[PDB]
Amino acid sequence: HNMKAFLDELKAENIKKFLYNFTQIPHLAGTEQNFQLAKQIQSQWKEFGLDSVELAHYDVLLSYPNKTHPNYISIINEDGNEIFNTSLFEPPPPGYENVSDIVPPFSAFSPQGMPEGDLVYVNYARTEDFFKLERDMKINCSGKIVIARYGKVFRGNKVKNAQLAGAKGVILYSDPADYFAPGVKSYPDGWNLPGGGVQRGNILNLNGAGDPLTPGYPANEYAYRRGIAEAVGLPSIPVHPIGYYDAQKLLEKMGGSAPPDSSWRGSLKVPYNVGPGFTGNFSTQKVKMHIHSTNEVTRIYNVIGTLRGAVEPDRYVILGGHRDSWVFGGIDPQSGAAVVHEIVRSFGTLKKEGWRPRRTILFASWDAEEFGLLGSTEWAEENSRLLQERGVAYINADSSIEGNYTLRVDCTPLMYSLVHNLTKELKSPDEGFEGKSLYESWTKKSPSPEFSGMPRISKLGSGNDFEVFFQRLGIASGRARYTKNWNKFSGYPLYHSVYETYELVEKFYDPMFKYHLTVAQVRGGMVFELANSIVLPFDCRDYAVVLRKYADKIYSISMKHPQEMKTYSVSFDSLFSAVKNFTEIASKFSERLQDFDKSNPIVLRMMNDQLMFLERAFIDPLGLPDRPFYRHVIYAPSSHNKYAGESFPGIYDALFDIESKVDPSKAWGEVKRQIYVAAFTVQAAAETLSEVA
Amino acid sequence: HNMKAFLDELKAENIKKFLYNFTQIPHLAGTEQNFQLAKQIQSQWKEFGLDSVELAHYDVLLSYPNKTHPNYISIINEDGNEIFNTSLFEPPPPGYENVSDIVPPFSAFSPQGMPEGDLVYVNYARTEDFFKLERDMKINCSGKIVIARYGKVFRGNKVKNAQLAGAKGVILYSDPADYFAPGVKSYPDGWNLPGGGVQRGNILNLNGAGDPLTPGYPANEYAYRRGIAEAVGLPSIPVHPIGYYDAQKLLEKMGGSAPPDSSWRGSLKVPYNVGPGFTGNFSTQKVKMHIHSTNEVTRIYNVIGTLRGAVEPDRYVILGGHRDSWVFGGIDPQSGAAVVHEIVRSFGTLKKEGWRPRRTILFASWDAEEFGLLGSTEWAEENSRLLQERGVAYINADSSIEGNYTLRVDCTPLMYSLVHNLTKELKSPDEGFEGKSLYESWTKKSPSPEFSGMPRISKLGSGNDFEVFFQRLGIASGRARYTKNWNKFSGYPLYHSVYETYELVEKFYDPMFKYHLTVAQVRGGMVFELANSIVLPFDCRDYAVVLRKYADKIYSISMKHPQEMKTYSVSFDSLFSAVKNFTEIASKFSERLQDFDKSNPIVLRMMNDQLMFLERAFIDPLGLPDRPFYRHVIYAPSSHNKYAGESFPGIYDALFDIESKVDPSKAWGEVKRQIYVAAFTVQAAAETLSEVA
RNA sequence: GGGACCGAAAAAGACCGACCAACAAGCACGCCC
RNA sequence: GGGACCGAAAAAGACCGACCAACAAGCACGCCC
Numbered sequence A, B: 001h002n003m004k005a006f007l008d009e010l011k012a013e014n015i016k017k018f019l020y021n022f023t024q025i026p027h028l029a030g031t032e033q034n035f036q037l038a039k040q041i042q043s044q045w046k047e048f049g050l051d052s053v054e055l056a057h058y059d060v061l062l063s064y065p066n067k068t069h070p071n072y073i074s075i076i077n078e079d080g081n082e083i084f085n086t087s088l089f090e091p092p093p094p095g096y097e098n099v100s101d102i103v104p105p106f107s108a109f110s111p112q113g114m115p116e117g118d119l120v121y122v123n124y125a126r127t128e129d130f131f132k133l134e135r136d137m138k139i140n141c142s143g144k145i146v147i148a149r150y151g152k153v154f155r156g157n158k159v160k161n162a163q164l165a166g167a168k169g170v171i172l173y174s175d176p177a178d179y180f181a182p183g184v185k186s187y188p189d190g191w192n193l194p195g196g197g198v199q200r201g202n203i204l205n206l207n208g209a210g211d212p213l214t215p216g217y218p219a220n221e222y223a224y225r226r227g228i229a230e231a232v233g234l235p236s237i238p239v240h241p242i243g244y245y246d247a248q249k250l251l252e253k254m255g256g257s258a259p260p261d262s263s264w265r266g267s268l269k270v271p272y273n274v275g276p277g278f279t280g281n282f283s284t285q286k287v288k289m290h291i292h293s294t295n296e297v298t299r300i301y302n303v304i305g306t307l308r309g310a311v312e313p314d315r316y317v318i319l320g321g322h323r324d325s326w327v328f329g330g331i332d333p334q335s336g337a338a339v340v341h342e343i344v345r346s347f348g349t350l351k352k353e354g355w356r357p358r359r360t361i362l363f364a365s366w367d368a369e370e371f372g373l374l375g376s377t378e379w380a381e382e383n384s385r386l387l388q389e390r391g392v393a394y395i396n397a398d399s400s401i402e403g404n405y406t407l408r409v410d411c412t413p414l415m416y417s418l419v420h421n422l423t424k425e426l427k428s429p430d431e432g433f434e435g436k437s438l439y440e441s442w443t444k445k446s447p448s449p450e451f452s453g454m455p456r457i458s459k460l461g462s463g464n465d466f467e468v469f470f471q472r473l474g475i476a477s478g479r480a481r482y483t484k485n486w487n488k489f490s491g492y493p494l495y496h497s498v499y500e501t502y503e504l505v506e507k508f509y510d511p512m513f514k515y516h517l518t519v520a521q522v523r524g525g526m527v528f529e530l531a532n533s534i535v536l537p538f539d540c541r542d543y544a545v546v547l548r549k550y551a552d553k554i555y556s557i558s559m560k561h562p563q564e565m566k567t568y569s570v571s572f573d574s575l576f577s578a579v580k581n582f583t584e585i586a587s588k589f590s591e592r593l594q595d596f597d598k599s600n601p602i603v604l605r606m607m608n609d610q611l612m613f614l615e616r617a618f619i620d621p622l623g624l625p626d627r628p629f630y631r632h633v634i635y636a637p638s639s640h641n642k643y644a645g646e647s648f649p650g651i652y653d654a655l656f657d658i659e660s661k662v663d664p665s666k667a668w669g670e671v672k673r674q675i676y677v678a679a680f681t682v683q684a685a686a687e688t689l690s691e692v693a
Numbered sequence C, D: 001g002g003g004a005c006c007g008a009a010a011a012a013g014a015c016c017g018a019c020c021a022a023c024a025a026g027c028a029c030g031c032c033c
């Protein structure tokens, strides 16, 4: 087996060295330091033995705090005395006190503002938290500064929900409930967030546009850019993140209504009152934000490496992950970048020996991912036609670890059998599973709710570089990392903090680098099999199985309004019919895939094209309603949470909060249109697996 | 040569028989007679030896006059006496007096109405005729019934221009200037239009949508249909066509301003006054329209025949033309349908002998073409994914003859060398070119203004079934017919009339059926070479050459406003750069295409894919501004004339009547955006011919 | 035969830039003499 | 230890239709006894 040779070349010691190398200085997007690391990686990928390695540059809107006018929040009395100020920077950790160019905590793409007003606590600032605030508790965030805890949903959605509720400011904070694991110590004595720690992060609502100034087209030297006024997904109110020390100061004086229930209570010793404003004596004190961050068009650099295929060089398997970090990127993304580096070194050594993959492999070091997947998206916009004609698969390589418990896999159903087979051939690195397969340890620790005796594999939404490839271009996509046990949908405590260091990983997450090595074997083994298997390792029958579940589910969600379904003759008959047809046609294609002569290079290429193009058949060039860059009809991010994936997203969005809609007849009409589009698309996808003539 | 064998099987006597067979009763879209002819063709294509022949049906909006409430126009006095009525039907021709189910003259998809008002003569009802009316002559069509002569532009554009000018009715008539050739006799004694003859035809503005009720998706059994109120491209005022006898009655009494110049004067003995209203005594007489036509969802039937390829069955060459007619379709479309039938019979005989084409050939008998390319477009919407993945080329087969002078070819630059080579190997059927090539007779009678010693090949716009394939899906497309000498952009006198018969073709156009045979050799030979050549016969260097002409042209058109170009820094630098790059890359790809080993089936398929997908690279999924179904960045129909093709249509539309625009800065900004999109698209297309890895 | 207007890129055709660092503007077909 | 509110499909998980011709609704984790 040529794969074992590849897997056995992968070394935890190499991953450890590369991780150390990538995490000693910050590599913020648009800074000289990240350009220097780009050039280092280009130079090393050549040395490692790639056929070519180019820098692809774009000029994209980034966001930076003003160094000589810092961002801070104040409690301010009616005399205008700033009696309490939030931190200007995170207290640096041991052996990082002398490190310059650490960007202070800030919300990227915040507008400028000095708004002052009454504080309203809005929990996680989810759609349902504003439904609870405004519909149930009759509280009105209009003209108020909202304070929200990080977690559950993408922070950009929180800011969007806040804007729609009339807020003039958003304060984001990390609550210990969400970012402090019980009975482990603050950094540097453990992996928990200290009270001065702050999660940086962008607050855009791009819905897959990439660079806000150049939607649809690469941000090249001659690009026509939108005015900032019509730029895509910019927030319209100021936003700033703080730690829980600073957050306790703002929250302790809160008056107005008590929290409705336990779902609104964090772990600080404060009442978690909703407001608006402060209790009793303090009622005439306000909160005032001071945001002077600037948006500016800055050059970014993707590293693109090529290992040309010996047989099908016009078929591309892509292994891509970002290089840019908020500070050191100890986990996010250098734990992924270090795995990609060792995978390149290892494919490189096989190349020097005189081995080549069947299909071309592309390796990508993406830039400006933290600013909204900007490097991956601009490159895909530049190369969309080649990618749609030639793209076999995309394997993501962000953070390798967010925990040390078990494997977490999100991929297209086309990769389910590949992932099952591979993890059965890999050793588990898990305590008490010595001599067992990764499949067994994974299936045991994370069983599928959907499939008895199978491991959980989740849906792809967005919030990483795979998005343009999968959701816009319909290229089969996969990601795998090590994760914690499920506190849930919050992340890891030290996410986007200065405390996210080399030492955090080495001391607390993966001292042996065995989890890193297992993830390198999963990502690398998947790339290997996609690039080298004679018949592409995609099982169309796994798509058939999940399409029936998604159809059962979307019917079930519509059935929340079963009287309306009757009034407006809402039928899923066409959708169930299409799924039944896909199942039958996939079954017959599978017979032909087993039977045919794989020595016939022309019949092989035909059947490989049918497999490669199956994911493309789910792409609608018109896109989903009000989201033209989300074109996959089976999968899209939640409108309300970029991180979360929905099945039959067109129907799902049409159904969401439908009982609120003023014109029932039109709203249910849109539901029936989306059933039509979905049934048509499933039948069309099925027909690509039919006999070609 | 296997092609000669195919060409020598084609027989003029067979085409004559089939033409007779297809033109004895009307075959209007949606009628039992056209269903019967569909089934006949399905049955004969099987007998001829196709591997399979299916009927593909759709339920589309068609339009019919009410049989028991006829359409007519009246001159009406202030007492409300209808003193003059227009014809209720065309006087039938000799030997057609006893023929039932001849649809009376009507404008398909006219709304219902009995509007009464003053007549304004608006010439051809072109954009420039309303600019002349409203800007120069200060005449105001608001609330007036407009009368317009057929010709120059698609009648649907005339109705659109009229609606935008505030007209409440449109009367279309055939002026002898445009539809009566000097010194030839009216049917049946010649090929000229008699004074009772009327051109039927649809008046939609679909801009490539297909069925008005189901834009983007096939009109299948479970389709969600728009309300008639939001249906695509329906006219909002009543419209009716009349002959020149009836038109003289309406035009003779016209008062108001004289015609501005000779360009407004037809050939009737009337003054061609503009109005509004009638002269002197007659000023209080009005015109009143009576339209009771109904729109209704009707089943239509495409015939789809397959000849599976022996080597690349997943590569499709399509030969398609419509079957539906306004009445007998003596020319339009049965002169084309009869050529397709003989091409099928001939491919069929080769199949029986045991020959197969390398690539699959699809044969299509399209329905409801006269109602807006509805059959071709719904089928393409159903099969868009297969067509984009597998479609090599589309050859149209509407009317084979509109004249007996020379060849007329409109195709992608990718087919220029194929067409040159083929016409050099075919005999000219032309008087005084006995023993010469069709290339020589054609080049002589129709020299290229663009290329010394080359024949004219024009651009594809719309107004036929190739549109969805080329303008929406980016499949390389071609058409060839015999045409008149250039009276121009009017058609042939008996177009869409009851007088367009078998006898018209047999007596006056092509008694020997030698023009039909030459067109069958061109269409059939092109299909043959596309389906059978080892290397696809596309020369990318012909695209390079024309892209430089189009760039020179669009620069030239922008330079009408050269001061504004400076004020707003409008530069074509990027566009010229992209074209220079395409030229260089196409030149190198051409070297590699000549050098490589064609015995390597995998290197051949790679290079054939690069050629096949080159046309697809010009497709923008976002579509052109305000025209989402026109996605080709190099070619689109004129916004003002569906029949006419524009190069760099995005830039062209942005520049059109720019000096009228209230915000110069925004309008010129859109021009710069379209330069950007065009340069990006040309560079992207060029890069698909680069080495793949 | 001669003359007058026009034909707003499907230019119908032919041809023609440094006191906007080569791609505007400007000689067949169909009321007067 | 027991109890109470909540967790609005990434359902966290398990399980459960003819006086809307099988796919609503309805038993782990984080003030009172």
Ligand SMILES: *[C@@H]1O[C@H](CO)[C@@H](O[C@@H]2O[C@H](CO)[C@@H](O[C@@H]3O[C@H](CO)[C@@H](O)[C@H](O[C@H]4O[C@H](CO)[C@@H](O)[C@H](O)[C@@H]4O)[C@@H]3O)[C@H](O)[C@H]2NC(C)=O)[C@H](O)[C@H]1NC(C)=O
Pocket (backbone or CB within 6 Å): A417, A418, A421, A536, A537, A538, A539, A594
């Ligand atoms: C993941 O792993 C699963 C489990 O192994 C795997 O499924 C299996 O794939 C193999 C390989 O195609 C299947 O093998 C075949 O079985 C059928 C009978 O059911 C045989 O007809 C096939 O015939 C062979 O004979 C040819 C003679 O010309 C040989 O040259 C040729 O190589 C064939 O081996 C063949 O034996 C097997 O049936 C399945 N098993 C199951 C339970 O499905 C799957 O392919 C892997 N998936 C991915 C995406 O990697």
Ligand SMILES: *[C@@H]1O[C@H](CO)[C@@H](O[C@@H]2O[C@H](CO)[C@@H](O[C@@H]3O[C@H](CO)[C@@H](O)[C@H](O[C@H]4O[C@H](CO)[C@@H](O)[C@H](O)[C@@H]4O)[C@@H]3O)[C@H](O)[C@H]2NC(C)=O)[C@H](O)[C@H]1NC(C)=O
Pocket (backbone or CB within 6 Å): B417, B418, B421, B536, B537, B538, B539, B594
């Ligand atoms: C339309 O017609 C034109 C005019 O014929 C045609 O262009 C020609 O195509 C041929 C076929 O490819 C070209 O032939 C080649 O010329 C180059 C030298 O310039 C040679 O290197 C090529 O080599 C051959 O040697 C191989 C040995 O392994 C042979 O096996 C192989 O078959 C090759 O023949 C070859 O001779 C020719 O140069 C051009 N001529 C011109 C003027 O361009 C064009 O291909 C046709 N286009 C379409 C779309 O049909």
Ligand SMILES: *[C@@H]1O[C@H](CO)[C@@H](O[C@@H]2O[C@H](CO)[C@@H](O[C@@H]3O[C@H](CO)[C@@H](O)[C@H](O)[C@@H]3O)[C@H](O)[C@H]2NC(C)=O)[C@H](O)[C@H]1NC(C)=O
Pocket (backbone or CB within 6 Å): A020, A021, A022, A024, A025, A039, A040, A043, A044
């Ligand atoms: C991460 O690792 C890379 C790769 O080893 C380090 O960069 C490299 O550092 C080496 C050794 O110091 C450099 O070699 C030297 O360069 C200097 C100046 O050009 C020269 O005078 C010396 O004689 C020696 O040859 C090398 O330039 C450089 N390699 C690359 C590809 O950039 C990098 O500094 C490490 N980073 C951290 C933070 O540890």
Ligand SMILES: *[C@@H]1O[C@H](CO)[C@@H](O[C@@H]2O[C@H](CO)[C@@H](O[C@@H]3O[C@H](CO)[C@@H](O)[C@H](O)[C@@H]3O)[C@H](O)[C@H]2NC(C)=O)[C@H](O)[C@H]1NC(C)=O
Pocket (backbone or CB within 6 Å): A074, A080, A081, A082, A083, A084, A085
């Ligand atoms: C929170 O931060 C703000 C801003 O840094 C602090 O308020 C500021 O305090 C400075 C220094 O005392 C004030 O400046 C002074 O102004 C007078 C002239 O008017 C000058 O002569 C003094 O010598 C002094 O420099 C400034 O007015 C004031 N600004 C604002 C907007 O409040 C605030 O004190 C901090 N709060 C805490 C609790 O630390």
Ligand SMILES: *[C@@H]1O[C@H](CO)[C@@H](O[C@@H]2O[C@H](CO)[C@@H](O[C@@H]3O[C@H](CO)[C@@H](O)[C@H](O)[C@@H]3O)[C@H](O)[C@H]2NC(C)=O)[C@H](O)[C@H]1NC(C)=O
Pocket (backbone or CB within 6 Å): A574, A575, A577, A578, A581, A679, A680, A683, B221, B222
């Ligand atoms: C899945 O595959 C099946 C089987 O090929 C498809 O079934 C077909 O469904 C349509 C109805 O949607 C049937 O079409 C016709 O409808 C008219 C209605 O007036 C009727 O007159 C015709 O006789 C015919 O019934 C068609 O018969 C039926 N075919 C079979 C064999 O059942 C189905 O539509 C596919 N699903 C999707 C979503 O495409």
Ligand SMILES: *[C@@H]1O[C@H](CO)[C@@H](O[C@@H]2O[C@H](CO)[C@@H](O[C@@H]3O[C@H](CO)[C@@H](O)[C@H](O)[C@@H]3O)[C@H](O)[C@H]2NC(C)=O)[C@H](O)[C@H]1NC(C)=O
Pocket (backbone or CB within 6 Å): B020, B021, B022, B024, B025, B039, B040, B043, B044
């Ligand atoms: C155009 O040509 C077609 C093909 O020849 C004509 O239709 C066909 O007419 C033949 C000869 O009349 C039919 O054969 C006969 O059918 C009847 C009734 O089914 C049967 O009783 C006779 O013994 C004889 O077999 C044949 O059905 C039919 N073929 C097809 C494929 O439709 C058609 O009528 C011609 N149309 C015109 C307007 O000339």
Ligand SMILES: *[C@@H]1O[C@H](CO)[C@@H](O[C@@H]2O[C@H](CO)[C@@H](O[C@@H]3O[C@H](CO)[C@@H](O)[C@H](O)[C@@H]3O)[C@H](O)[C@H]2NC(C)=O)[C@H](O)[C@H]1NC(C)=O
Pocket (backbone or CB within 6 Å): B074, B080, B081, B082, B083, B084, B085
């Ligand atoms: C143009 O066509 C219209 C409609 O066919 C003609 O006008 C119509 O003429 C009929 C027959 O004379 C009129 O009907 C009559 O009505 C009275 C009762 O009111 C009845 O007793 C008579 O016996 C007669 O049938 C009808 O009113 C009238 N309709 C309209 C809308 O005008 C018109 O005469 C035709 N014009 C020419 C020049 O042929």
Ligand SMILES: *[C@@H]1O[C@H](CO)[C@@H](O[C@@H]2O[C@H](CO)[C@@H](O[C@@H]3O[C@H](CO)[C@@H](O)[C@H](O)[C@@H]3O)[C@H](O)[C@H]2NC(C)=O)[C@H](O)[C@H]1NC(C)=O
Pocket (backbone or CB within 6 Å): A221, A222, B574, B575, B577, B578, B581, B679, B680, B683
């Ligand atoms: C057609 O192909 C040429 C040749 O590869 C492409 O040329 C490249 O054009 C860009 C400018 O648009 C140059 O990029 C860079 O711009 C920054 C500006 O700050 C500058 O700092 C860099 O040094 C660099 O000049 C690039 O140098 C240039 N390459 C060459 C070899 O001339 C051209 O863009 C392609 N055309 C299109 C439309 O893609």
Ligand SMILES: *[C@@H]1O[C@H](CO)[C@@H](O[C@@H]2O[C@H](CO)[C@@H](O)[C@H](O)[C@H]2NC(C)=O)[C@H](O)[C@H]1NC(C)=O
Pocket (backbone or CB within 6 Å): A066, A067, A068, A069, A294
């Ligand atoms: C960062 O903040 C500083 C200080 O407020 C800004 O510097 C000022 O710039 C404007 C000129 O545009 C001047 O009016 C002020 O006098 C400047 N002040 C100082 C101390 O230099 C600076 O422009 C900001 N940087 C940005 C917006 O990028």
Ligand SMILES: *[C@@H]1O[C@H](CO)[C@@H](O[C@@H]2O[C@H](CO)[C@@H](O)[C@H](O)[C@H]2NC(C)=O)[C@H](O)[C@H]1NC(C)=O
Pocket (backbone or CB within 6 Å): A140, A142, A143
């Ligand atoms: C929530 O409070 C806001 C802010 O006071 C209300 O908006 C205003 O309502 C008045 C009366 O209709 C308008 O005339 C003002 O223009 C609004 N003020 C601002 C600053 O926008 C809002 O109506 C309240 N919403 C609810 C649902 O009670």
Ligand SMILES: *[C@@H]1O[C@H](CO)[C@@H](O[C@@H]2O[C@H](CO)[C@@H](O)[C@H](O)[C@H]2NC(C)=O)[C@H](O)[C@H]1NC(C)=O
Pocket (backbone or CB within 6 Å): A191, A403, A404, A484, A485, A508, A509
């Ligand atoms: C690495 O793995 C260890 C061992 O599983 C994790 O520590 C345990 O966490 C559980 C509950 O999640 C506690 O009940 C135990 O007290 C811990 N076990 C031991 C042996 O200490 C640790 O949390 C993991 N590290 C990270 C960063 O996730």
Ligand SMILES: *[C@@H]1O[C@H](CO)[C@@H](O[C@@H]2O[C@H](CO)[C@@H](O)[C@H](O)[C@H]2NC(C)=O)[C@H](O)[C@H]1NC(C)=O
Pocket (backbone or CB within 6 Å): B066, B067, B068, B069, B294
């Ligand atoms: C065609 O026109 C006739 C005559 O005007 C229409 O027939 C009428 O239909 C309505 C019922 O919808 C009745 O009110 C009238 O009494 C009918 N008249 C006659 C003589 O039958 C017919 O509906 C029209 N056809 C259409 C619209 O398709």
Ligand SMILES: *[C@@H]1O[C@H](CO)[C@@H](O[C@@H]2O[C@H](CO)[C@@H](O)[C@H](O)[C@H]2NC(C)=O)[C@H](O)[C@H]1NC(C)=O
Pocket (backbone or CB within 6 Å): B140, B142, B143
């Ligand atoms: C052309 O005539 C129409 C119709 O009379 C004019 O439109 C009307 O103008 C008045 C005065 O502004 C409006 O109040 C009416 O509502 C219009 N009437 C209708 C029936 O629409 C129109 O303004 C004239 N256009 C020009 C450019 O002179």
Ligand SMILES: *[C@@H]1O[C@H](CO)[C@@H](O[C@@H]2O[C@H](CO)[C@@H](O)[C@H](O)[C@H]2NC(C)=O)[C@H](O)[C@H]1NC(C)=O
Pocket (backbone or CB within 6 Å): B191, B403, B404, B484, B485, B508, B509
């Ligand atoms: C078929 O071809 C004939 C011969 O070219 C066409 O008739 C001539 O038309 C020219 C001008 O266009 C006249 O000057 C001659 O009087 C005609 N020649 C002869 C020999 O009569 C005829 O128009 C063509 N038929 C059609 C339908 O286009």
Ligand SMILES: O=C(O)CC[C@H](CP(=O)(O)O)C(=O)O
Pocket (backbone or CB within 6 Å): A201, A202, A332, A369, A370, A371, A372, A373, A398, A462, A463, A464, A642
């Ligand atoms: O903007 C996005 O889509 C996500 C960016 C980034 C993803 P990462 O933190 O890099 O996993 C974030 O969540 O802040």
Ligand SMILES: O=C(O)CC[C@H](CP(=O)(O)O)C(=O)O
Pocket (backbone or CB within 6 Å): B201, B202, B332, B369, B370, B371, B372, B373, B398, B462, B463, B464, B642
């Ligand atoms: O609607 C169209 O695009 C054109 C239909 C038809 C084309 P044809 O007459 O069939 O050439 C017409 O012009 O009326």
